[PDB]
Design goal:
The structure is cut from a larger assembly and holds two copies of chain A. Chain A is mainly α. Helix content of chain A is about 65%, strand content about 0%. Chain B: Belongs to the Bunyavirales RNA polymerase family.
Chain lengths: ~30, ~50
């Protein structure tokens, strides 16, 4: 339980948002 | 008791079990077994 809580907290802190022809599909799908 | 988190005080675990205890609607205590057991206990104490 302590291990799962600690690593869950680390992962949660790691997702908080911070304050040619191929280019068309790239910008539409991957870059977006 | 129902997650992999950890608390800071065991008052919280006491309250967790308390909350899980009150999810069971009152009136289950109105079952025949509970009245039978309280009658049995009273009669046994009287016999003693």
């Amino acid at each position: 339980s302590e291990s799962v809580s600690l690593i869950t907290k680390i992962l949660s802190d790691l997702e908080l948002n911070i304050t040619t022809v191929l280019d068309k599909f790239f910008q539409n799908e991957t870059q977006k | 008791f129902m997650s992999r988190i950890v608390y800071k005080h065991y008052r919280s675990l006491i309250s967790e079990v308390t909350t899980c205890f009150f999810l069971f609607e009152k009136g289950l205590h109105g079952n025949m077994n509970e009245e039978a057991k309280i009658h049995l206990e009273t009669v046994e104490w009287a016999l003693k």
